[PDB]
Design a protein around this motif. Structure first.
Motif, short mmCIF file in Angstrom:
data_model
loop_
_atom_site.label_atom_id
_atom_site.label_comp_id
_atom_site.label_asym_id
_atom_site.label_seq_id
_atom_site.Cartn_x
_atom_site.Cartn_y
_atom_site.Cartn_z
N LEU A 225 -24.07 -25.56 38.19
CA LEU A 225 -24.04 -24.95 37.33
C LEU A 225 -22.50 -25.49 36.57
CD1 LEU A 225 -24.77 -22.09 35.60
CD2 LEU A 225 -22.15 -22.02 35.78
N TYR B 204 -21.01 -28.63 56.51
CA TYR B 204 -20.02 -27.68 57.29
C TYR B 204 -20.38 -25.92 56.92
CZ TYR B 204 -15.82 -30.14 57.77
OH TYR B 204 -14.68 -31.04 58.26
N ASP C 2 -18.46 -31.37 32.35
CA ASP C 2 -19.25 -32.22 32.02
C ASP C 2 -19.37 -31.86 30.55
OD1 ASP C 2 -20.87 -35.63 32.26
OD2 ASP C 2 -21.77 -34.12 31.18
N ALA C 3 -19.51 -30.46 29.77
CA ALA C 3 -20.66 -30.86 28.23
C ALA C 3 -18.82 -30.05 27.74
CB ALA C 3 -21.51 -29.52 28.30
N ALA D 247 -28.71 -21.11 55.60
CA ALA D 247 -28.90 -20.12 55.35
C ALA D 247 -29.14 -19.35 54.04
CB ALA D 247 -27.57 -19.55 56.22
N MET E 140 -13.68 -46.98 39.89
CA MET E 140 -14.00 -46.37 38.61
C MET E 140 -13.02 -46.58 37.48
SD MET E 140 -15.25 -42.55 36.49
CE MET E 140 -13.47 -42.40 36.92
N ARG F 258 -25.62 -34.02 27.46
CA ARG F 258 -25.72 -32.96 27.57
C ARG F 258 -24.87 -32.16 28.93
NH1 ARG F 258 -26.69 -31.76 22.41
NH2 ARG F 258 -24.58 -30.95 22.64
N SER G 241 -26.65 -26.28 28.34
CA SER G 241 -25.93 -27.31 27.86
C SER G 241 -25.20 -26.90 26.17
CB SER G 241 -26.13 -29.00 27.71
OG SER G 241 -27.30 -29.06 27.38
N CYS H 254 -31.50 -25.75 32.03
CA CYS H 254 -30.04 -26.61 31.44
C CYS H 254 -29.24 -27.32 30.69
CB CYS H 254 -30.19 -27.86 32.43
SG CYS H 254 -28.71 -29.18 32.77
N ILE I 227 -23.64 -23.78 25.37
CA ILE I 227 -21.71 -24.22 26.12
C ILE I 227 -20.96 -24.92 24.85
CG2 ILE I 227 -20.50 -25.57 27.67
CD1 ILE I 227 -21.40 -22.72 29.02
N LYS I 228 -22.09 -26.84 24.87
CA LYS I 228 -21.35 -26.51 23.90
C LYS I 228 -20.94 -26.40 22.20
CE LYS I 228 -21.53 -31.80 24.31
NZ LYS I 228 -20.93 -32.52 25.61
N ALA J 182 -24.36 -31.69 35.82
CA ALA J 182 -25.10 -31.30 37.12
C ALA J 182 -25.68 -31.75 37.93
CB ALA J 182 -25.90 -30.58 36.31
N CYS K 114 -18.83 -38.26 36.16
CA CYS K 114 -18.57 -39.61 36.02
C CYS K 114 -18.03 -40.19 34.49
CB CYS K 114 -19.26 -40.78 36.85
SG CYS K 114 -18.61 -42.35 36.52
N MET L 86 -22.31 -29.10 35.70
CA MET L 86 -22.98 -29.29 33.94
C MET L 86 -21.86 -28.96 32.94
SD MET L 86 -25.39 -27.73 32.06
CE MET L 86 -24.07 -26.15 32.15
N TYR M 123 -26.15 -33.02 32.20
CA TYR M 123 -27.16 -33.81 33.49
C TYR M 123 -26.82 -34.38 34.08
CZ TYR M 123 -31.08 -32.73 29.73
OH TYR M 123 -32.13 -32.05 29.11
N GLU M 124 -25.73 -35.03 34.29
CA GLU M 124 -25.17 -36.02 35.14
C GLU M 124 -24.10 -35.40 35.65
OE1 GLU M 124 -21.36 -39.47 35.21
OE2 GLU M 124 -23.33 -39.76 34.26
#
Lengths: 225, 225, 225, 225, 225, 225, 225, 225, 225
Positions: free
Chosen positions: B130, B113, B136-137, B118, C133, B95, A5, A1, A8-9, B100, B1, B133, B97-98
Motif C-alpha cells: 500500500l 528475517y 508511486d501514485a 507468523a 536504471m 495508477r 489509487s 487498489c 490518492i491521486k 504496489a 521503478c 502504491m 500497480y507497479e
C-alpha cells in the motif's frame, strides 16, 4: 487498489477554466459596463453575476443598470453542464471486479486464523468480497464540465448593419427562412469558456464557489483594465 | 521503478517557448511603443507586462502610455493555460500497480528475517504494498501548457480599410451577421506563442518567473532592434 | 545496453541544414546588401548576423547599413527551436527498465563471490539495479530542431503592387479584414531553413557555433556570387 | 551477422541520378550557353560548375560569361542534402542487440577451453558481448540524398509576359500579395534532379566526384547535342 | 535455398517494353522523318538513335537531317533509369540469415565424420555458416527500370496555336507565371515507354542491346508503315 | 456480481438536462409571454406547460392567452423519447451468463453440507444457476432519453420576411417544391434540449416530475429575468 | 440458457414510437380537419384512421369529409414494415448450438441413474441434445419495425407556388424530366414516424392495437390542441 | 446440426414486401385506371396483372382498356429476380464438413455394437460420413429477391413539359446526347418495391402466388380508396 | 470432400438473367420491329436473333427487315463473356491439398490389410494421395458471366436533336474532341443485361441454348405486349 489509487491521486479539488478565443478591444477611456447573465443549465450559479460585477469594479469600470447608457455589454449564458466518471474510460476494472477479488482473497486471512475449513470460511470470504466490491464501486472519479457562452458588445462610431438570418427547420421536408436588416452603432463579439471541476466523490456544492470565482475572473479579464 | 525513472529524467524545470509564425516589419526609425497585456487564464502572470516593457526598453525603443502617439502597438493576451500529467499517456502502470507490486514483493524481505510465517508477514507485506502504491501514485510528471495571442500594430501611410465581419450564432437555427467598415492608417498582424513548463511534481509558482521571462523576450524580439 | 548503443552510435555532433525551396535571382552587377536578422526563439544565436555578413563579404558583395541604398535585402528570423529525445520514439525500454534488469542480474556476480545468500546479496542486487536504471535514464539522445524564415528582397524596374490582406480572428464568431495597397519597386521572396543538431547528452552551447556557421553559409549562398 | 550482411551487400559505392521530368527544346543552330550554379546545401560541390562547362563544351556548345549574349541559360541550385542510415528502417536488430548476443554466446568458447567456471568466464563473455555490440553498432549503411533544381532558359521570338505573383505569409493572420508584370523574349522551364550515393560507412568526400560527374552529365544532356 | 530458387527461376534475361497510350496518326503519303534522341539518365544508350533510324528505314520512311523539310518528327528522351533488387521486397530472408543457417547446420556434417567435438567442429561450422551467408547475400535478383518520353510531331494544314504556360516556383511563397502564344502548322503528341530488364546478378552492359532493340522497335512502330 | 455493481452504482435517480445552443435576446421592458407546448412522444409529460408557466411567472413575466398581444412566444415540442439499457453496451456478461455461473458454483455449497453426490446435488445446483441467471437478467440499467424542440419568438420593429421553402419528396423520382413569402414583425429562433434519466429498473412515472421540473426551468431561464 | 435469458428479458410487449422532426404550426382558431390514411405495407393497420379521428376529435377539432372546406389536412401513409430477429445480431450461439450442448450434457443425467453404458445412454443423450437444439432454435426475439410518412397541409393567405419537378429514370442512359407550376393557398409539410414492437415469439396481431394507438396519438398530437 | 437448425428455423414460407418511398396523390373524384404490367425477369409472374385489377376494382376504381380516357395509369415492371442461399453468408460450415463429421463420429456407433475393428467399421464410418455430408449439403436456406419498378401517372390541369435527356454511351470515348421537349397534361411519379421469399429448399412455384398477392395489394393500395 | 460438396451442391445447371434498369415505353398501336443483334464476345450465340424474333412475334409484333419503316428498333450487342471458378474464391483448399491428404490417409487402408510395412505401403499411399489430389483438382465449379448491351429505339413526333460528343484520347498528353448535331424523329434508350450460368465442370455448349432463351425472353419482354 484502483479505487485507492484514484482516491490518492485526485484527493484535491482541481478546477480549470479555459477561454476558446481572444476578443480584441481597442483602448478606450469609457468605463460604463452593463451585465446580463443567464443560466440555462441544471446546475446552480446564482452568485456568478455578483462576482463578475465585483471583478469588473475592481478594474475601475463602473457598472450601470440601463443598457442604453453603457459603453460595454457583458452578456453571458451558462449554457451546458455535464457530470461524468473518468474511471468509466477504462470500462473494465471499474464495476468492482478488482475489489471483489481482493475481498475474496481476504478469505485466506480467515483460513489461516481461528476456525478454518468449517464452512464459515466460505461465508466470510463471500461477505468480504461483496463488501470489497461495494467499496470499490462507491469510489467515483467525478468530473463536472461546464460550457458558458460570452457575448461582448462595444459601442462604436461606424454604422453597423445587422443581418438576421434564420433557417427554422420544418419537418425533414423544408425550412422557413427569416431575414431582416437593422442599423445600429454597436459591435458584438462572441466567445466560449469551458470549465472543469475534478475530484473523488465530488459534490457540485463544494465546487460551485471556486468555479464561479474563476469564471467571473476570466470574463472580467476580457475587459483588461 | 517507473516513478523513479520519471523523477530522475525530469528532475530539472524545462521551459520551451515557440512562436507560431513570423511577423515581418519593415525597417523604420520610429521608436515609440504602446503595450496592452491581458490575461484571461486561470494562471497568474502579473509581471509579464513589466518584463515586456524592460525587454523593449533594452532594445532602444521608448514605451509610451497614450496609444495615439505610439508608432508600434504590442497587444498580448495570455489566452489559455492547461496542466497535464505525461505519465497518463501510458494509461497503465501509472495508477500505482507497479509500486504496489514492489511493496508486496518487499514482504519476502520480512519472510527471510526475524519472525516469519507468523501472520504478521502478510500484514507487513500488505502495508508495504500500500505504501509503495501511494508513493508511486504521488509522483507526477506535470506539464503546464500556455497559449498566448499576440497582435502587433504598425502605423503606415497607406489608407487601411478594416471590414468587421461577425457571425453571431443564434440557437442552431441561424446567426446574426454584423458588418461594418472603417478607415485608418494602421496595419495589424497576429501570431501565437505556445509555452511549456515540464517537471516532476512541479508547482506553477516556481515555473512562473522563467515562463514570463521567455515569453517577454520572444514578444520583444518580434520588434528586433 | 541500449544506452551503450546510443552512446556509441551518436558519439559525434551531427548537424544538418536544409533549405525548403529555391529562390531564383536574375544575374546582376549590383553588390549592395542590407541585413536584418531577428531571433524569436528561446535559444541564443547572437553571432548569426556577423557570420552572415562575413560570408556575404567573402562573395564580393558589399554590406551597407541604410536599407534605402541597398540593392538586396536579407531578412532572416530564427523563428522556432525545439529539443527532443530520439530514444522516446520507442517509448518503452527508455525509462530505464533494461538498465535496472542488468543491474539486478549483476546480483549473481555477488552470489558467486564472497558472502552469499546472507541477505546482503539482495541489498547489493537492488542497489546495483537502481544504479543501472539511473545510468540508463541519464543517457539521452538529444536532437535540437531549429526553424528559420528567410525573406530576400531584390530591387527591380517594374512597378510592384503589394496588397496587404489580413484576417484578424475575433472570438470564434468573426474576424476583422484589413486590406491596403502600396506601390514600390521591390520584389520579395520567402523560404524556410530547417536545422538539426544531434548528439548524446548534447548541450546547445556546443552546437551553437556550427549551427550558426551552416545557417549563415546557406543564407549567403542564396545570393550566389 | 546483420552487419556482416550489410557490409557484404553494399561493399561498393552505388550512385543513382534521376531527372524528374523532360524539358523539350526545339532544334536550333545557336550554340551560346551561360551557366549559373549555386549551392545552398551543407555538402560541398565546388567542381560541379566546371564539370557542367566541360560536358557542355564536349557537345559543341560554346560557354559565354555575359548572360545578355547567350542563347541558352543553365541555372542550377544544389538545394538539399540529407544523410540517412538504411539499417534504421528495421528499427530493431540495428542498435547492436544481435552483435551483443553473438559476443555473449562467444563465452561458450571460453567455457570449453582453458580455465572455466572460474568467474573469469563471465567477465570474458561480457567483454566479448560488449565488443560485439560496439562492432555491430559501428557498421552503418549510409545513404546520401541530394536534391537539385534546374532552370533552363531559351531565347525565342515571341513576346513572353512574366507575371510575378508572391504571397508572403504574415503571422498566421494574413499575407502580403505582390504582383508585377514584365515583358521579355525568353522562355524558362524547370526540373528537379535527385541523386543517391549508397555505401557502408561512406564518407561524402569519396562520393563527391562521381556525384558531380553524373549530375553534370545529366544537366548537360538536357541540351542534347 | 532461396538464393538457389531465385537463380533457377530468373536464369535468363527477361526484357519487357510497354507503351503507355496510343498515338493515332491519320494515313498519309509523306515519308520524311527527323529524329532527335536525348539521354538524361545515368545509364548509357548510345545506339538507340541508330537503331531507331534503321527500324524507320525498314518501313519505307526516309530519314532527313534538317527538321524544316521533315513531315514527321520523332523526339525521344531516355528520362529515368533505376536499379532495384526484387528479393528486397520480402525484407527478411534476404540479408543472408537462411544461408547462414544452412552453413551452420553443415557443422553436423563434420560432427559425424573424422574428428568431432574437438573444438574444431565449432570453428568449421562457424566458417561454413559465414560462407553460406556470404554466398546467399551475393545473389541478387536485379531489375532495371527505364522510363522514356516520346514526342511525335506531325505536319498539318490547320493553323495550330501553341500557348506556352509555365509556373516557375519561387521559394514557397509564390511563382513566376510565363505565358506566350505562337502559331504554326504542326501537331505534337506525347507518350511514355517503360522498359524492364530482369535477371540474377545482371550487369547493364548485357541488357543494353536488347533494351535498345525493343525500345527502337516500339518507337518506330508508332509510325506504322 | 455485475448486476450487483450496477445496482450499487446507479442506485439513485440521475437527471441531466442540456441545452444545445444559446439564444440571445436583447434587453427589453416587455413582460407578456404566450406559451404553446405540444408532445408528440409516447411518454406522458402533461404538467410541463403548468411548470413552464409557473417558472416564467416567478421571473416577473406575465402569461397571456391570446398570441396577438404577447411580446414573447415560447413554443415547445417534446419530440422524441427513447428507453435503452446501458448494460447492453457490453453485449456479453449481460444476458445472465455470470449469474448462471455463480448459481452453478453455489452447488458446491450443497456438496459440502448435508446429503451430497446423491443426484439431488446436481438438481439443486441447476436450480440455483437458473435462479441466478434470472436474477441477473432482471436487473436493468435503464436510461430514458428525451429530445425537445424549442422555438422562441420575439417581437421587433424591423420588417421580417419569412420565405417558406419546402421540398416534399415524391417517390424516389422527384419532389414538389413549395415556396411562399410573408412579411411580419416577429423574429423566431430555435434550439434543442436533451434530457436523460438514469437509474436501475427505473419506471418513467418516477422520473417524470423531476424531468418536467428541469426542462421547465431551462426553458424559462432562456428568458432570463 | 441464452434462449432462457431472452425469454426472461423481453417477456413483455415493448412498443416505441418516435417522430423524426417537429412540424411547427402557427396558432389558429380553425378546427376543420380532413384525414387521408393509406397503407402500402404487408402488415394490416385498418383501425388507424378511426383512432386518428377519435384522437383528433378529443382535442376539440372537427373532422370533415370534403377536403375543400377543411383547414387542416392529415395525410398519412404506412409505408414500410419489416420483421427481424435481434438474436441474429450475434450470428453465433443462435442457431441452437448451445441448446444442443445442454441437451447432450443431459446424457450424464442418464449415465448416473438407472441403466448406464448400455448403448441406450448415447441414444437418450442424442435425443435430448436434438430436443434442446430445437427448443433453443424455436425461441425468437422478434422486432417489428414500421415506417410511416405524414404530410400535414395548412391553409394560409399567401399565394404558394408548387413547382413539380420529377426525374423519371430511363434505362441507365438517361431520364425524362417533368416540370410544372401551380398556384394555391395551402402549405404542406412532411415528417416520418418510426415504430418498433419487440417481444419473444411475438405475433403481429397482438402488437397491432397498441401500435395503432401510439401512432394515432402521435399524429394527432402534431395538431396540439 | 446446422442444417437441422436451418430447417427448424425457416420451416414456413416467409414473404416480405416493402415499398421504397411514398407517392402522394391529391384527393379526387375520378375513378378510371389503366394498367400496364411487364415482366423482364427470369421468374414467371403471369397473374400479377389480374390480381392488381381485382384489388383496384375492390377499392371502387374502374379499370379501362384505352389509356386515353383513363385518369390514372399504373405502369409496373417486374425488373429483377435473384435467388441466393443465406447459409452461404457464413461461407464455412456450409459445404458439408459438419455433416461429414457427424457421420464419421457415427462410426463409434458400429465400434460398440456387433462386429468391430474388423475393417468393415472404417467402411461403414466412411459411408455414414459421406451420407451425412450429402444430407447437410442438400439443405438450402433459399431466399428469392424481386425488384419491381412502379410508375403512376395522374392527369392534371397544369401544362407539364417533359424534357427527354439521354446520354447513350459510345465506346469509352464519348456519348450521343439526345434531347427533346414535349407538352402534355399528365404527371408521372416512380417508386420501387422489393419482395423477399424465404424458406428451406423453397421452389419458386410455391412462393409465386403469395408474392403476386402481396405485390398487387401494395401497388393497388398506392391508390388508396 | 470439398470437391464432393461442390459436385453435390451445384449438380444442376443454374441460369440467371438480370436486367439493369427499366425502359418505359408509352402505349402505342404500332407493331413493326427491326432487330439488329451483334456478338463481340469469344462465346458463340448464333441463335439469339432468331429466338428474339420468335419471342417478339409471339407477342403480336411484326418483324420487318428495312429499318426505315419500323416503329421499334431492338439493337443488342453481346459485349462481354468471362469464365471463372467459384472455388478459387477460397484460394486455399482448392489446389488439391485436401484430396491429397485423403489419398495419403488411405494408406492406412493398406497398412491394416494384406502386406504391410513392406515399403510397398508407402508407394501405394503416395499413389493414392496423388490420385486424390488430381481428382480434387479436376472438379471445377465453373460460372460463365455474360454482359449484353441493349438499345431500344422508338419513333416519336417531337424533333429529337442528337449531339454526338466524343473525346478520342491522344497519347497521355491530350485528346481530339469531335462534336456534331443531327435532327431526327427517334428516341433511343439503353440498358444492360447480365447472365450467369453455373455448374460443376460445365461446358458452354450445354449452357448456350437456355442462356439464349432467357436473354431473348427478357429482351422481347421489354416491349411488353
Amino acid at each position: 487498489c484502483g479505487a485507492m489509487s484514484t482516491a490518492i491521486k485526485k484527493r484535491n479539488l482541481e478546477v480549470k477554466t479555459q477561454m476558446s478565443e481572444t476578443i480584441w478591444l481597442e483602448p478606450a477611456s469609457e468605463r460604463t459596463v452593463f451585465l446580463q447573465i443567464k443560466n440555462t443549465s441544471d446546475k446552480d450559479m446564482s452568485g456568478l453575476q455578483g462576482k463578475i460585477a465585483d471583478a469588473v469594479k475592481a478594474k475601475g469600470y463602473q457598472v450601470v443598470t440601463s443598457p442604453d447608457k453603457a459603453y460595454y455589454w457583458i452578456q453571458a449564458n451558462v449554457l451546458k453542464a455535464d457530470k461524468m466518471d473518468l474511471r468509466e474510460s477504462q470500462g473494465w476494472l471499474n464495476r468492482g471486479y478488482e475489489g471483489a477479488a481482493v475481498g475474496a482473497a481476504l478469505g485466506a486471512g480467515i483460513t489461516g486464523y481461528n476456525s478454518n475449513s468449517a464452512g464459515a470460511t466460505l461465508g466470510v470470504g463471500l461477505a468480504a468480497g461483496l463488501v470489497g466490491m461495494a467499496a470499490d464501486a462507491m469510489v467515483e472519479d467525478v468530473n463536472y464540465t461546464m460550457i458558458t457562452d460570452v457575448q461582448i458588445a462595444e459601442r462604436t462610431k461606424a454604422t453597423v448593419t445587422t443581418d438576421n438570418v434564420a433557417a427554422l427547420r420544418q419537418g425533414t421536408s423544408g425550412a422557413k427562412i427569416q431575414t431582416s436588416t437593422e442599423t445600429g452603432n454597436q459591435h458584438k463579439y462572441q466567445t466560449r469558456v469551458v470549465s472543469n471541476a475534478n475530484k473523488v466523490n465530488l459534490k457540485f456544492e463544494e465546487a460551485k464557489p471556486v468555479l464561479e470565482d474563476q469564471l467571473a475572473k476570466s470574463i472580467a479579464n476580457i475587459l483588461g483594465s
